Design a protein around this ligand. Structure first.
Ligand SMILES: [Zn+2]
Ligand SMILES: [Zn+2]
Length: 83
C-alpha cells in the first residue's frame, strides 16, 4: 500500500483529482515510464495544505513516477516524494 503511493506537493490551488490523474497518466505513458498497457494512476487524494497523494496500480509505476519530481503542471513545479 505505501509502495503504491507518492506524495505530490506544491500542487496548483483548486486543481481536481481528475485533472491530476489525467496529466500523470498521459505524461507517464508518453514518457515511456510504463511497461504494461493501461493507465498507471488509479486515484488522487488532495488534502483538505497544497498537496496530494497519488495512488498507482503497481509498485513498478509508483517507482517510475519518481522520475517526474519537478515536473511542471499548470505552471507549478511539483515536488514528488515517497510517503
Ligand atoms: Zn479525464
Ligand atoms: Zn476522489
Amino acid at each position: 500500500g505505501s509502495a503504491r503511493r507518492l506524495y505530490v506537493g506544491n500542487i496548483p490551488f483548486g486543481i481536481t483529482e481528475e485533472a491530476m490523474m489525467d496529466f500523470f497518466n498521459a505524461q507517464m505513458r508518453l514518457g515511456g515510464l510504463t511497461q504494461a498497457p493501461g493507465n498507471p494512476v488509479l486515484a488522487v487524494q488532495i488534502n483538505q495544505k497544497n498537496f496530494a497523494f497519488l495512488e498507482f496500480r503497481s509498485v513498478d509505476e509508483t517507482t517510475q513516477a519518481m522520475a517526474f519530481d519537478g515536473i511542471i503542471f499548470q505552471g507549478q513545479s511539483l515536488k514528488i516524494r515517497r510517503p
